[PDB]
A paper describes a structure:
Mtb GlgE is a genetically validated anti-TB target as the absence of Mtb GlgE leads to cytosolic accumulation of toxic levels of M1P by a self-amplifying feedback response leading to cell death. Previously, we have shown that hydroxypyrrolidines modified with an α-configured − 2 site sugar can inhibit Mtb GlgE (Ki = 237 ± 27 µM) as well Sco [name]-[name] (Ki = 102 ± 7 µM), a closely related homolog from [name] (Sco) [name] that has been mutated to be 100% identical to the M1P binding site of Mtb GlgE, and affords much higher quality X-ray diffraction data.
Residue numbers in the entry:
A (entry chain A), B (entry chain B): 15 to 663
The structure:
């Protein structure tokens, strides 16, 4: 038995960990399956992709083509359907009809071996007819056979009879494939559309209170949901909603001593009042949480809860399960760290004394919130807990509940970041906030939209409570507008943390990425109604971008993305396509100066020939332009951060 | 079960076809095994390579190191011993001693938790000592334990006792490894040294005749073997030695009709006199061939026979096994082609009517020559026969006779070139003859000495009967000298085709790579005595290069190779190392003009600091130089093609 088959089919992609983990897609998402295919000699090969659903049923006939001359690399686009575990193979074969037609078109006009070449075609078409089940289809091919053999007909007419549309139609439904050779199946995990596509909004329920009761409840925070839904978001991500420890509770601005009424960090989970399966008493009860989830769902909002596998020194686990922590020789537990940052208010979990008990308890907690309608979890710093722990936990949960989505907040080195995605995390936080120049954005999105897309789905949060980038600090509102346009149009999943739309951008100090007076350590009442009346919010732009995404399928996918050259380093241009929908975006990355540039479009990447016009509508303004292969743009910060255009068909 | 283990070990290399085929090595060859290794959290990891012989016996402790900062890619060099099928794994582990030392070096001077830090250190070193055999080593560690616990000494003194060179020494030999996690084994096929290392000489026995009998016999051709052994060659490659067909025999200069005296192409195998298992009657008998083999072996020469799976129209196969050929409807068999080459004198083989019969006959023919002492086969155009056919044939032969070496003469597209090596060909011809500029040579050898070396062993023939490159045509003798130095020092296997040493460089016509009056179609007597006496041969340079290779282990391997920058595009520089042996080569690629340049050596790549001097001997002349990080060279074509230096002491 040989490893290589009769017609070699080699190195099928996408592949993840040599086939030990599945490649990823979502329902309705297209992607390319590729392979190295060739044969000995110079006759033509053909190849096709066989995509099989969870019941083993094959998809449509999906022929591949050589992707670049002389490379022997072949590809075809497939489209994922219903959720579940699929598989794909590549089949390769000798293509005798293509081979013969190429020879006949050369030899017959020159009168070379005319009778022999035509007879080769005749018995070939007889061979193709042998497998054709329909009487009328066979009669079609046999008619071409008889014409090819008709020596009382001019040679050019004998040949032409083999090349009619009616003949092609029979062979398109019953191609003659010789020496068919197949790869061994590769796995594909197809998940729900929200795993790839959605707009996220993060806020702290406790900040949405009243003057008499400053600490918000789930009942008072629910009245923020209409604004979030009106802004076009799909997912509401809440920081931890559990009781918060008192021992070593942090004060305002990340100080080490809480005083008086200080509320502490929600990530310092646990007290005698309860742990990860309980509600902070100041937020209300489990019934109040159910009300919040119900009202969110009525507005089309899904809840994502924070899952932080750690605890305050007051969490019941500390004395119930000491073996879930690392102890020093005096029995004390060192506080958690993530250098240069220190988390003096929490203990990290240790995994090597009782990994089974920890897995059991983790999936118990997840299933509790899942029973209360939470089908999405934002997992904190997963890279400080074992990779195989997450692989086990995610397999357990998705085994019974495949719709649950896990988002990995792993800002770390690339190997870890990729591996967490590959072992099951549906979504990943990314380096987006630290990619701000044209070359940074072009290189990083080229990576994310390329091979990484077979295992990672990016969530572009333009800010988080822990990341206020210097680009926003120094650029002000025009910079918030730019980063919103970029996040919303470069990834099918993007997000903001509350206050982004108010352009809050005061750092803790120069050179920090923390917010001054951070909401992680204090209630932050915001007068949303006043900000809207004073026009100091970019909620309208955010709303518009989410509507554009909902109206243009090209923005609801990741992999089809092309950057078009401009002649100014501050002006970036790119297009995305899905079916007949094309979106073309031009962004001025300079938040301080107007920028003029010529955008030179790669017309064929738009499906257009070089002389065609490009009728576009700028969805930010409603204006129409008659663009072509080279277009002058002028973008003024504070007025026109970008053009977000749909190509008119 | 999870795919990822406790400590992630991912993407172990070398790997061939995802582990379905073995990686390659030869006895005594060192190569790098690498992996992606990291863990959760901030603590240190270590890793090591476990190489196991065919009996499962493990090699020595082989610790790995991170290859570049922040990449999580680790590697170590291993060395293959005896031939057979080996395996290797990577083990990764938590490194608690490195972790503790890092924290102690910070916290002790800071005065943070110093009692706890020192006691954790004492318990850790006690754990490390538990596994140390040898009273001396275990006692050394336990003495550090007791010093760490000695509260009558200052904290800094207690720590310092854990960090002494004598303590490091024990830990380097008995490292304390936690959470040890293994990759799954990967296969390694270790073959005899000649598969990687050897000098090859090709000649036509029939050209080595006498004044009275111009068609050489095996007995007259045996008289050429002493001169071949004297230039330091190890392998003699003969074109086909079988009867030659008469139907469509080619005449001189690749003309289509032979006259009565014309000898034809040796590749047009077969006649009523016999096929692939017979001797051309003008060469003599099988007993004469045995004499030739015996004489070669006495001179230290191995024979490689040409194996051409094809035949003339007169071969016995044509009537005995018609199903081994594709017949057109009129019964004709189209002559072979390798476009744009046409081979009107031969039929190609067809593989799908009787694959078992062809495989049986192929291995029968090989075993016949194998029984007569031929253990190396040069396989013509293997890419025009099925890849899986060669996989089957090579596995059959090497299953009973693992010493047999197959060389693939596949000048074709890269995918096929790579796949043939991967399915078992011990050696491959390469693009060497079409890589002549500095950029071409540097890029191509970086490829061959990199990942490709896990599955392909290059044989650098500087010419063949089918390839007289324009570089040699235009450059004359100084170009022959340059290509000899390059071939002999950049690959552990190189070769020339007879007449190269005479600088034969007249092409068939401008733009051709054929020789005028090619030896493929006519006897080519050469006056070896005259050329030697008149000094118009570069045989002494060839001899010196083979002696240098025999004296310098760095030149008997492939993968250790580094290119050093020069300031002249015509001057290339590179070094190779094997243990303490370092060879440094500087070549002037210009065959017409003297070139002077500064070679700026990457000193750490030579194991030297930037300021040191390196004493070198130019092995081509015996002159000694004192070189450093920057060295002036002046190379005069005709006088000096190159410096081929060894580093002294
Ligand atoms: N990256 C994740 C996990 C981090 C650890 O919880 C969390 O850090 C917050 O919570 C800590 C514990 O309460 C505080 O010590 C800390 O100062 C504060 O910033 C991040 O906000 C969150 O995004
Ligand atoms: N590449 C391999 C195989 C080739 C095909 O056999 C062989 O071609 C030679 O032999 C043919 C058959 O006799 C001739 O028609 C041809 O003109 C001549 O060049 C090559 O020399 C050899 O290196
Ligand atoms: Cl953080
Ligand atoms: Cl050839």
């Amino acid at each position: 038995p040989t490893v290589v088959g009769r017609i070699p089919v080699l190195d099928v992609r996408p592949v993840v960990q040599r086939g030990r983990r599945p490649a990823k897609a979502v329902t309705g998402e297209s992607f390319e399956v590729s392979a190295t295919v060739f044969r000995e000699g110079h006759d033509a090969v053909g190849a096709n992709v066989v995509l099989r659903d969870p019941r083993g049923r094959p998809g449509p006939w999906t022929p591949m083509r050589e992707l670049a001359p002389g490379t022997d690399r072949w590809g075809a686009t497939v489209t994922a359907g219903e959720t579940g575990t699929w598989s794909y193979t590549v089949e390769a074969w000798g293509d005798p009809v293509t081979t013969w037609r190429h020879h006949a078109r050369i030899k017959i006009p020159a009168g070379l071996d005319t009778d022999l070449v035509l007879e080769e075609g005749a018995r070939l078409y007889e061979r193709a007819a042998a497998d054709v089940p329909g009487r009328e289809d066979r009669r079609e091919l046999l008619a071409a056979v008889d014409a090819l053999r008709d020596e009382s007909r001019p040679a050019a007419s004998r040949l032409a009879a083999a090349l009619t549309p009616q003949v092609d139609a029979v062979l398109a439904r019953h191609p003659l494939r010789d020496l068919v050779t197949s790869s061994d199946p590769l796995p594909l995990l197809v998940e729900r559309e929200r795993a790839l596509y959605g707009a996220w909004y993060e806020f702290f329920p406790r900040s949405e209170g009243t003057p008499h009761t400053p600490h918000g409840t789930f009942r008072t925070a629910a009245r923020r949901l209409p604004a979030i839904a009106a802004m076009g978001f799909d997912v509401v991500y809440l920081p931890p909603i559990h009781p918060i420890g008192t021992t070593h509770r942090k004060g305002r601005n990340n100080t080490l001593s809480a005083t008086g009424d200080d509320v502490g960090s929600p990530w310092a989970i646990g007290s005698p009042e309860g742990g990860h399966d309980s509600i902070h008493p100041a937020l209300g009860t489990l019934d109040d949480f159910d009300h919040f989830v119900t009202e969110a769902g009525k507005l089309g909002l899904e809840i994502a809860l924070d899952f932080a596998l750690q605890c305050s020194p007051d969490h019941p686990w500390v004395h119930k399960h000491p073996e879930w922590f690392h102890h020093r020789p005096d029995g004390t537990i060192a506080h958690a760290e993530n250098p240069p940052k220190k988390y003096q208010d929490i203990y990290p979990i240790a995994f090597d004394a009782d990994p089974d008990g920890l897995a059991t308890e983790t999936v118990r907690i997840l299933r509790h919130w899942m029973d209360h309608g939470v089908r999405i979890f934002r997992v904190d710093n997963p890279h400080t807990k074992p990779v195989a722990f997450w692989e086990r936990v995610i397999a357990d949960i998705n085994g019974t509940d495949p719709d649950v989505i896990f988002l990995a907040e792993a800002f770390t080195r690339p190997a870890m970041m990729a591996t967490l995605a590959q072992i099951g995390f549906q979504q990943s936080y990314t380096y987006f906030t630290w990619r701000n120049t044209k070359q940074e954005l072009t290189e990083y999105l080229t990576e994310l939209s390329g091979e990484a897309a077979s295992y990672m789905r990016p969530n572009f949060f333009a800010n988080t409570p822990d990341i206020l980038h210097a680009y926003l600090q120094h650029g002000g509102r025009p910079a918030f507008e730019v980063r919103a346009v970029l996040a919303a149009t470069l990834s099918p999943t993007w997000g903001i943390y509350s206050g982004y739309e108010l352009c809050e951008n005061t750092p803790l100090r120069e050179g920090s990425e923390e917010y001054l007076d951070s909401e992680k350590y204090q209630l932050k009442p915001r007068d949303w109604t006043r900000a809207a009346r004073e026009g100091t919010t970019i909620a309208p732009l955010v709303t518009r971008l989410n509507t554009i995404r909902r109206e243009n399928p090209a923005l609801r996918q990741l992999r089809d993305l092309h950057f078009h050259p401009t002649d100014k380093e501050e002006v970036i241009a790119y297009s995305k396509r899905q079916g007949s929908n094309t979106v073309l975006v031009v962004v001025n990355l300079d938040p301080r100066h107007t920028q003029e540039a010529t955008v030179s479009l790669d017309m064929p990447q738009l499906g257009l020939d070089w002389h065609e016009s490009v009728p576009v509508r700028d969805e930010l303004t409603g204006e129409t332009y008659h663009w072509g292969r080279a277009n002058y743009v002028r973008l003024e910060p504070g007025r026109t951060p970008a053009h977000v255009c749909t190509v008119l068909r």
